[PDB]
Amino acid sequence: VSEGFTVKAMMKNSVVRGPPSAGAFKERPTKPTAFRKFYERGDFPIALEHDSKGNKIAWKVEIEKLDYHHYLPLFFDGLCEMTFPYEFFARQGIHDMLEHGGNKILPVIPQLIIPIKNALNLRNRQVICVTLKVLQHLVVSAEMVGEALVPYYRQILPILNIFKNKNVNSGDGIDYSQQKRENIGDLIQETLEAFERYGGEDAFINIKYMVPTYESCLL
Amino acid sequence: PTKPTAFRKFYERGDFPIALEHDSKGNKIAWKVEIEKLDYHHYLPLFFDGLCEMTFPYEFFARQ
């Protein structure tokens, strides 16, 4: 019945009411993206291979010499989608764009922070599985992406910060979800040591600045 | 009146290579190592602690 720093709630009997709530750990409303608006219009050279082994993206052009200055900031633009077809070309396209080719991923990563962070601001628990799988794959399948991302932990790490410790507390209980990577506080760990392992020197400071419980391994 | 010793709590553990030849002549302790190269610093004060034994199997190992 009480409210706070008043003449009430200084009584010898009272029940106080604290703060209402906070917008952390709770899922956010979504927004219309741009991959929707450009897939219906029809510029994408993608179709859907329907194999016996699963589903794969069919390609009607070169994957190597694509215009990645248009496209790489347009599939992270549609990473934030949960309806079935639209998440599939977004997730499966990004892997095949990245493992092909080279010597062009350096000047396009300045323009990717807006739909990396907006993929992560949503507080949903399957994109944070998916978008934190490619951040390991982003750093590996290129050369010298490490030294270009070292002033870029100030903008993407606050959302690894709140969720870095997400694990399972079960004593001798065997788990069965280690096949897929559902468990996020696992996946936030080995992504952060993947940032420090690459990036050269002087990047061990720049996670300790941001996720404060960090311990700079790999001397 | 007596109190239990260190010999009793070291035979149940089982460091000693003592075993009992129940002879028809009598009773003699078998030795599964040479008696010369035993560690007498480690052993001679310990069998003397079994000297305060009255019940059967431990007082025999002390005396013999």
Next chain:
Amino acid sequence: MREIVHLQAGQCGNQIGAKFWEVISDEHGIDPTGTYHGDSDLQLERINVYYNEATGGKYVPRAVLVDLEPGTMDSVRSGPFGQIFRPDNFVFGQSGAGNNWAKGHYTEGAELVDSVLDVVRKEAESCDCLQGFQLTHSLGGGTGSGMGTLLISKIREEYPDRIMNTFSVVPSPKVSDTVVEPYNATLSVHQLVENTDETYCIDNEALYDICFRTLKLTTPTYGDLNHLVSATMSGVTTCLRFPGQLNADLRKLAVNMVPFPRLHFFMPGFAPLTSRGSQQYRALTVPELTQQMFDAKNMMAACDPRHGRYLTVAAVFRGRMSMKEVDEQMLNVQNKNSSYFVEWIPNNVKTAVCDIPPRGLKMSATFIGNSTAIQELFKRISEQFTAMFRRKAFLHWYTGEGMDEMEFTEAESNMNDLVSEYQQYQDATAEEEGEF
């Protein structure tokens, strides 16, 4: 032996530090012309934290005053105590910013800052051991705010092991003179998170609400509001200037309130504020400093602390007081209201006492309480700014002055940085995985 240099920014900066120096000069007993017509020795023990000696028995501040309008800051000499300043310290431009932070950053502020830094080095190598500097400004205009960003961002780069206080008037939600307020307000704070690590965020409508509902003035002016803010500016750093039973300098509070190196936007207050008709009738005890100082009415910023969680609390007291009663009031409030106060800090309040009160008062106290209801100021600044910036309202007097358009887009997510950080440390739990 711990000197400090006062640097004031802009028209409101020179209006605030013209009455702050009346406050210091009257509490150190010195006349309008400069001389010590005072009756103590505690008024000339530690006067070298602020003042400085001339030949013939005069004291001058270590005050350097910056402005982008020529006729503004030579109306400050014409005040009562306005001739105590040495005239070399006055630095002023020719063509003003025009209430635009871009004109105060790139174009017209970048040629005054060399001369400003020359006077700053002259006033800052003179000392014994320089503790720090002070800044005073508002985040509505451009001469104050754009220069106030540029000079702190190029003063920390050469004096980095020093302390650097900031007084910021953040713009108000529901009273708003300047139409182009949110551009300046969301472009200044990413400089003030990186550049100061110490900033007191005060607000004009909260300064109005005290003068309407507590002091009950029929007609408050900007002199009365400036008199409110300077009586907190003094009481924060008394303990440098006066002896204490338990004392605490500015380095003592700066290490203590800030848990992680961004979380430094604080909300002042002042304890025995009383109407003139109800002044004589009301007692002054330490419960009647604590109840009035923690009160959500008598706060000095627009954030209501009942909409969040206190991160750390200060209190600096002035008078002759008893340490048992001073140290039991904080415990009484903190365990009697214990859903606000943060869980993983077990005793959250820091306290100091000083012996020498303000003039005519038997006791006083001052509040600096780091709360997590500062998320709301950032959220409403972001809302008005992105509402204007979605259809690109007034962009060209900032964009024809040498700017990219994506500096705005990064200067909104350097603000959504701190919104989510203050939402993290407010909902963080004593035992983890209790809330997922």
Next chain:
Amino acid sequence: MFKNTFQSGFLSILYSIGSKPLQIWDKKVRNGHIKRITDNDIQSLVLEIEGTNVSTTYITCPADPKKTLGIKLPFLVMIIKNLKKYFTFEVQVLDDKNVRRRFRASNYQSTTRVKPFICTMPMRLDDGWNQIQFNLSDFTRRAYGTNYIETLRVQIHANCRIRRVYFSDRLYSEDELPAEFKLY
């Protein structure tokens, strides 16, 4: 108490491939967690303890606080991973003049202090799956003028990966070891 146990050439008080491994040990978790999977090269499940703090999350060996395991064997061999974060492990002893003395080896100490009950030493893990073979009856002879009788507890705190905790009556070369006790 492992009193009527025969206590042969080897003895083991935990293993990872088990219906219930942490059956005798008392688990205590605070700002942490426990699970059962971590496997770099060997396809075999492994216990987990980690939390941000190196002191609250632990698993003590006697579930009863009073009961003691009396173990005579001169070594103490564990198969525990490296992580490049902290670790402490503790095993206290009993010596010839009937006194309860300690031995702590953690990652991050500079030099060893010797004191009546407490002696804290450094420890350096190798890069791979290290297995450590610990010397009990020489460390109680260098730090004190004692001789060894038994070791009574084992308690392991934060940030490691556990499989096959055991003791040894002597030292073996790795070719001498039985195949179920080997590293691989």
Next chain:
Amino acid sequence: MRECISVHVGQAGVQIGNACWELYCLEHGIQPDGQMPSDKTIGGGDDSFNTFFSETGAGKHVPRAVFVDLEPTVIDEVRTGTYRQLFHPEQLITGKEDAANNYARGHYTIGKELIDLVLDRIRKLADQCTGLQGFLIFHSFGGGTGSGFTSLLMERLSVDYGKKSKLEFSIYPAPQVSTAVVEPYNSILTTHTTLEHSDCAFMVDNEAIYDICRRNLDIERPTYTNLNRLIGQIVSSITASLRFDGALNVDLTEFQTNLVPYPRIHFPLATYAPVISAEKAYHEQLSVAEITNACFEPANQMVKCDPRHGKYMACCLLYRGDVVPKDVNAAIATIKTKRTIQFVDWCPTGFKVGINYQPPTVVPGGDLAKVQRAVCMLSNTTAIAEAWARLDHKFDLMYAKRAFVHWYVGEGMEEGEFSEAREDMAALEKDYEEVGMDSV
């Protein structure tokens, strides 16, 4: 020739000093200026002052103190307050900027800009000595140079002076009341360095002294004057066996052999029984039996730590005044008859008793009364196990999310020196369990 240097570290250590150095100039006849009056003697001579004071030719007494500090405006209260000329200027040595409530600033950043000068004055005070018993230090475990430079003060004194009886008094930070937010980081890092280097150590909370001034002396609203007046009476009685001879004698060495059973257990906990105000002092006759009762009583103890939750290991009593040894032993044996007062079964003897002859002196402006006889207790109970099992969690409340750690890690050290510090309280807490459990 029995002599001891005094060290008063920190702005809180100066406050302790001038309540304890006004106390000594009344106990002898020394004036504000350091010379006794030509007429108007106070007692019979015999160089009783010589443990603390020292003599020039012309007839002056200057103390064997050194007031070390980093905060230059608290000693300037002493440089112009009434005891202006009692000291040299060279004993009062102030820095330029404080540690600013960082032990790691006081240990590594600032403290060695004032460690050459301390160990040059210390040699000049202690080479004119001949029979130096030890030193004293006075501090508090909240602040920066109370925590930090005192660690460098004594680890330097461990190797410069070898084995002298470097005594430690302290203030341990209270359970609930706390002036600071960085408080438990200091006390778990400074207890780690006052294990190896102090010979004995005295804990006293500020919160408990608040309780007895409110209830025994019955002054509502005490101040920090009335907390340092009481600490002086306790320090007075420790060294009273060294200045004024008595029926029994106990020097500093005969505490250390007699209180502390093992080299990590040197935390006694004190009280002083007739803390009685003068409106209700002179009415009641105050026998030596019923002041032995009030030393044991749990409300009157000086740390929030009562021995009803553990068991005593050794006790040590310091009687003064009009006290005869037959009546001391009549009340020692009464305590041993009750089952509520639990003595441990490796001390069947239990007690150490000293009787001196001089009644405790009384200060003007102070708040107690002039009583014939008094008593001070220095026990050593198992119940100190709650004075770290609270500090550990209150430290671990913060450290498991790394609050405030950037203000010490950046200022000259590394992250592991916190986790080597909680381990020793995870070792000390089991020792107080170990030496308390009964042998079967």
Next chain:
Amino acid sequence: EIPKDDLDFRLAALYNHHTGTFKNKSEILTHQETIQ
């Protein structure tokens, strides 16, 4: 049951010295015989 006033304060007075804070005299000595 009590012999003296060392034991009247030290019977079941039900005051933890570590846990009671800022108490008066009368709330220290509170035996179980006054509660029920």
